[PDB]
Amino acid sequence: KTYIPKNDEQNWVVVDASGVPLGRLATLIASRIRGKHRPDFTPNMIQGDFVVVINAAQVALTGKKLDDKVYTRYTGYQGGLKTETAREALSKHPERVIEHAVFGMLPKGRQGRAMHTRLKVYAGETHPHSAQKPQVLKTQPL
Template identity: 35%
Template sequence: MNNTNVQKCSNKQKWYLIDAKNQTLGRMSTYVAKLLIGKYEITYTPHINSQIYIIIINAKDIIITGEKKYNKKYIKHSGKPGSLKIENFANLNKRIPTKIIEYSIKGMLPKSKLGRKLFKQISVYKNEQHPHSAQKPQTITTNL
């Protein structure tokens, strides 16, 4: 008879550090989303959390190509009349540079309970300082 092997959730956490300085937003976001989902792991299973935690530093130095710096819009609405807020990339990057990377990665994750759990495993910081040095993250130095 054929037996099916079912992967179980491992409790071993892996921590990665990614420097966003001079990285293209879309290319870095797709790499981070795939890494977070576990696509680069040998034991990839779509419905299991791979226990990968990612720290992204230097979010203020992210770059985007073309005229998107002025044309890309970030829209939020509270649901109340007259509360629509529209902001372009340049203004949001000055104000809250971490939100740009978070929005980009969140859009690439699955829209389910697992996707919401995976999103909590990302930490984005606008400078080089981060409080996760005790976890000894592995630095990823790829040009994306």
């Protein structure tokens, strides 16, 4: 008896990451992606709008962006394949700092993965707006 599905929708929002606390922001992104105020609001499949983040490179942390925030990454058979970098150390690819803090606050299943697909970050600003030809409702954080 409960409601069914739709589709012909793909709200194309553009959140700004500037100065905002990565995490907070993240949660937000992770929100809409999966399902915000949701349409049919349903599991089975995703209807959670498409997210575009600009800047990123200017996200924000606090006491540690040198200390503590160490994005680890362990490659091949761990024959000492213990590779880690300070977050500030992610000045080579801020892009991932976000992108790779959100794919966390998102289901980890089959669908879950297919959901990073809709998240789409850009380390810049206006130039980013180029990889942007559809809608662009700028729903900043709070």
